[PDB]
Amino acid sequence: YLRRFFKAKKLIE
Incomplete structure (x- = not known):
């Protein structure tokens, strides 16, 4: 998931 x-x-933190 960390991919996105x-x-x-x-x-965009």
Whole structure:
């Protein structure tokens, strides 16, 4: 899941 949970927050935390 972190696939989208990582790239997400990274730029949109």
